[PDB]
Design the sequence.
């Protein structure tokens, strides 16, 4: 059903020294709370003329499908990672939250400081200090340029073993390059982001209904005024409808390190 | 032939968030186009006197 | 410049425009004048840059 | 060690999560300790003992 609820901890007991044999003991109580996961819907509708659909070179309902499936992928990814017009019932988008927790690292350190690997070495510290441990890297294509350019004060490579020759791994962690084309890579100082690192185990995604596919033979297509754009029946046309239902949540729970919740996040970012 | 033609994909569909439990599910088409591979020619003439050839 | 890995650093750079345009290269074409500039790939102390790659 | 659990063959550990004095003036903060831990003794007269109350 439409929403789910997770119970979670919110305070811990504490102990005390007793003054002498006779000093009075002291009091504490635990408290819990809860977090929610909401669901939202993606849809599209596609029309075509009936004669065209027969006289065509090859079958469009086979040709189009992979491109529809990709598009249904990318709108989701875009909304969650960057907050691109996302429905307001979701949590705050990843990049703004990492910045709000103070876990965003500005690029720029000298070859003597370890060059660009020195910034990545710094990025782990933010996650570790928030009490989590990272397990994978997500990046835009421009990160390859920085990695390829990581050079010593005399021009040789920094830390020469520590990166896979295929650019698929660093420190033995896996790397990947999705949403390619979307990554904010032009703009003023500090607006641009090159990679993310975090504990990806912390994030959950729920799908309530997969890609559902329906043909239409005799419906009517409107615009927001209630005027009619196409009478699918009288005009000898056909259409296809797609829908999908999803939501996600982050479980940034209380722990002994970084107990003030506004300062935790299970990820960190590299920015310019 | 003096030309050949290649079909190619020109634009892609998109998708939308539905507003609430009831709102218009907005709409998209998809489009192809083509390219053309023309042909041209290189040539020369090389003249010489017959006595030189002998 | 030598501290940036010399001429190899700019070949490394030239790879980043093709990558970003969504492709990756698989062969190199050059004028013979490259040979000398390529042998000139020296570290600030005089050793070779990136010795095993070439 | 690549796991950050050993230096020079000695073991390392990270207890009291969040307590380590890490902000203040100059010289107010401490990062790590090294020693011969064999020389330190602890005695416990009784374990955790537990009672429930009504009145």
Sequence:
């Amino acid at each position: 059903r439409n929403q789910v609820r997770f119970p979670v901890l919110s305070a811990l007991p504490v102990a005390y020294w007793v003054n002498g044999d006779t000093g009075l003991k002291q009091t504490t109580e635990i408290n819990w709370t809860n977090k929610y996961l909401n669901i939202e819907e993606i849809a599209t509708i596609v029309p075509v003329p009936d004669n065209v659909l027969a006289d065509v070179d090859v079958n469009v309902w086979d040709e189009a499908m992979p491109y529809l499936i990709e598009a249904f992928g990318r709108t989701l990814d875009s909304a969650v990672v960057f907050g691109t017009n996302a429905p307001g019932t979701f949590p705050q988008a990843i990049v703004p939250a990492i910045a709000a927790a103070g876990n965003a690292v500005t690029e720029g350190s000298t070859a003597a400081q370890g060059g660009y690997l020195g910034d990545l070495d710094k990025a782990y510290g933010k996650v570790e200090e928030d009490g989590f441990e990272a397990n994978g890297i997500i990046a835009g294509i421009g990160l390859k340029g920085k990695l390829r350019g990581a050079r010593d004060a005399n021009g040789q490579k920094i830390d020469p073993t520590r990166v896979g020759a295929d650019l698929k791994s660093i420190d033995g962690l896996p790397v990947s390059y999705p949403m390619r084309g979307l990554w904010p890579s032009a703009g003023g100082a500090g607006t641009n982001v090159r990679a993310l690192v975090g504990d990806w185990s912390q994030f959950v995604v729920g799908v309530r209904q997969d890609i559902t596919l329906k043909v239409l033979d005799q419906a009517v297509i409107q615009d927001n005024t209630g005027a009619i754009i196409y009478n699918l029946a009288q005009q000898d046309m056909t259409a296809l409808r797609l829908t999908f239902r999803v939501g996600w949540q982050v479980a940034n729970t209380l722990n002994n390190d970084q107990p003030t919740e506004a300062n935790r996040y299970p990820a960190a970012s590299l920015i310019f």
